[PDB]
Amino acid sequence: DFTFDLYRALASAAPSQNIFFSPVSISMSLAMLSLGAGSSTKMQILEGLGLSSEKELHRGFQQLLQELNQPRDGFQLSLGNALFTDLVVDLQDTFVSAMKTLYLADTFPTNFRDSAGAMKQINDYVAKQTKGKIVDLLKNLDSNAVVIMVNYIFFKAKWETSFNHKGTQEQDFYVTSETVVRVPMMSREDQYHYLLDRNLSCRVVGVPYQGNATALFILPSEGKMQQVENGLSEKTLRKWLKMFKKRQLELYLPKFSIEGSYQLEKVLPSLGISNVFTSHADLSGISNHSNIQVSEMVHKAVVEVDESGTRAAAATGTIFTFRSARLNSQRLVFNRPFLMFIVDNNILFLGKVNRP
Amino acid sequence: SEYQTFFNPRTFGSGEADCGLRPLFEKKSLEDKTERELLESYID
Amino acid sequence: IVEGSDAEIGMSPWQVMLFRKSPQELLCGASLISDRWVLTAAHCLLYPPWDKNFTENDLLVRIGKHSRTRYERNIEKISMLEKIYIHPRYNWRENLDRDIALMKLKKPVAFSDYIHPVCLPDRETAASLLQAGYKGRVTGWGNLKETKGQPSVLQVVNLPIVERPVCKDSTRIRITDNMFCAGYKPDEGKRGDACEGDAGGPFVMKSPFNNRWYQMGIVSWGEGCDRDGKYGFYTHVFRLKKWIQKVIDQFGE
Numbered sequence A: 001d002f003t004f005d006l007y008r009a010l011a012s013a014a015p016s017q018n019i020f021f022s023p024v025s026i027s028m029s030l031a032m033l034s035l036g037a038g039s040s041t042k043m044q045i046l047e048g049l050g051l052s053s054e055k056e057l058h059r060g061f062q063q064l065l066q067e068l069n070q071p072r073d074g075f076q077l078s079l080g081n082a083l084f085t086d087l088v089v090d091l092q093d094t095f096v097s098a099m100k101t102l103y104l105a106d107t108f109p110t111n112f113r114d115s116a117g118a119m120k121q122i123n124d125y126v127a128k129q130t131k132g133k134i135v136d137l138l139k140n141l142d143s144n145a146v147v148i149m150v151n152y153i154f155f156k157a158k159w160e161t162s163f164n165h166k167g168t169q170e171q172d173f174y175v176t177s178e179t180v181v182r183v184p185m186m187s188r189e190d191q192y193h194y195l196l197d198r199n200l201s202c203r204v205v206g207v208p209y210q211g212n213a214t215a216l217f218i219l220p221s222e223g224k225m226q227q228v229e230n231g232l233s234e235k236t237l238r239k240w241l242k243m244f245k246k247r248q249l250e251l252y253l254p255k256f257s258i259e260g261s262y263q264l265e266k267v268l269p270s271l272g273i274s275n276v277f278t279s280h281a282d283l284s285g286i287s288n289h290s291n292i293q294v295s296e297m298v299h300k301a302v303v304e305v306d307e308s309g310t311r312a313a314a315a316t317g318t319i320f321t322f323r324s325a326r327l328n329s330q331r332l333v334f335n336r337p338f339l340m341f342i343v344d345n346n347i348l349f350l351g352k353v354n355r356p
Numbered sequence B: 001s002e003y004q005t006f007f008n009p010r011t012f013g014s015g016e017a018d019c020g021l022r023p024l025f026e027k028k029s030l031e032d033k034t035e036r037e038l039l040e041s042y043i044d
Numbered sequence C: 001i002v003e004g005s006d007a008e009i010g011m012s013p014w015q016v017m018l019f020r021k022s023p024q025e026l027l028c029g030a031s032l033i034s035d036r037w038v039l040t041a042a043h044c045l046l047y048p049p050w051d052k053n054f055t056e057n058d059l060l061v062r063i064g065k066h067s068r069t070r071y072e073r074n075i076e077k078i079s080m081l082e083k084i085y086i087h088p089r090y091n092w093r094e095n096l097d098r099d100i101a102l103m104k105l106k107k108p109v110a111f112s113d114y115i116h117p118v119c120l121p122d123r124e125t126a127a128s129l130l131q132a133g134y135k136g137r138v139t140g141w142g143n144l145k146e147t148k149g150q151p152s153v154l155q156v157v158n159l160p161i162v163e164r165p166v167c168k169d170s171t172r173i174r175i176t177d178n179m180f181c182a183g184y185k186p187d188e189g190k191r192g193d194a195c196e197g198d199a200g201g202p203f204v205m206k207s208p209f210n211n212r213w214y215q216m217g218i219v220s221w222g223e224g225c226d227r228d229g230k231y232g233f234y235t236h237v238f239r240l241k242k243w244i245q246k247v248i249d250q251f252g253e
């Protein structure tokens, strides 16, 4: 699907590099943008989102955005959207209203003829909105910008079952067969939803978060990362979730913080969404001025993986004890490039951890 | 050693008629090291 | 087996070792009741919460063994399984009630000085032998202590059957008539119990009426091993004999 076509596009543009973004967050950003688009410009965006009804589309995100806004004391989620428009650009009331009402996103007039100043204005705003989690969103603001759309999201939730911080120990990580790095490796022998995809040749483990959200870690077999990436799809994801079986594993997972920052105007065109980023963009919904286009569409996703979990993670199960031999434990070590998904009802995050 | 079979060899297979008599013990009139303890537990 | 001793050669010719495969390792104990049928515990094979579901293709059985690790040429026999049958009402959700499973050998095993079936009890023998105070015998290659401590050869321990009221008061688990418990009381001065790896093995008793060994129970669950004031529990073989008969009649030929 679109989410996976984008993933591959990003990985292709930056080989052997960490890739990390929020599929649902970008979909929201695009849906929001479609509010001010028209003609073919709008069509490309909708086709990209693979879209029932527009009213339904926006309603869904509005609600979804409301839910993710409910401070569920077990998660740390900061999702935001904002448009910065050059001072000279006249904004349409209908568009500004729809953005605030449907996507809780504000529009801010900005003097782009003063890069440094505008860049600080934007970064400062994002930092404020993300409580300091997402700072320095922009690193180089091209002069003469017209409209800059920013989409940011931070996430950090407690695992259903904790990782003994006394079990976390720094280990070797093979970015490549030749390049090795030391990384804090968390660990815990226990039962996990596990699956061995022989088709794509990768091992998939599910580690649930406190709630209905779960993290999926995929370790391709030697030299099969590219093969797994090409196989990534909605169908494949659905499959994994369905073929999962509880298995006793001696799991070794790196403790880390991963982030991804992207200039979507540089990649989306190759995926079919191009007009909105050109001078022939039909953004009549946003402004009645003719030289209106999305100069930059920045997306930044940051997720932190630690040991913190709901319970002490141990014992329990049954009063009686089996007298059969203990379950055989399999070793699963994520010490080389792996893929990661964070899913609820939607794909919250998707990426490749090339270097923790 | 009196024993009345309960199963049908057609479905059970062979061996029931001579069940529980060990080749290296009962069949050789030899006792294992602790079976006396079991027999003594029946005294009351 | 905790606080047991080394078995003598051919002392338990009905002893069966149950294995899992790839990797292959000891899974449980079991017992030979004919040249085509083997008895074991249901919890050795199935437990939904852990996605444990060992089928014929995941298992193998070794018969006639003494050593836990050494292959015994011209003595031990390896038999694949044709099919496995677990009691349909095996209560894995609560107390492991009806913890029993039958396994049919892919090919009949030849008897020898080391391989010979044990008897299953008739009503009179069960009534006569399964009584509080009388001692039975448990065998297995399971751990020697609750807390790798594994035996070099088959272990054996003789244990007294315990009165049902005492068994009931010893645990919070609901005990049923398809279970009995055995072991020494704190004041009896002796110890012994089955443990991890012994499940599925036989609890046998020697009949003084015909000099034959009868399997009265199957090593089932417990709470730890050889703990003070606790007792090991066993599947009551006679009470499930009708089920055994039914399964054999339907799938034995």
Ligand SMILES: *[C@@H]1O[C@H](CO[C@@H]2O[C@@H](C)[C@@H](O)[C@@H](O)[C@@H]2O)[C@@H](O)[C@H](O)[C@H]1NC(C)=O
Pocket (backbone or CB within 6 Å): C053, C055
């Ligand atoms: C135990 O497994 C039996 C067979 O399951 C099927 O075959 C195995 C090899 C796997 O491919 C599995 O995904 C298939 O479903 C089931 O018929 C049986 O129900 C299972 N145990 C129970 C009673 O849950």
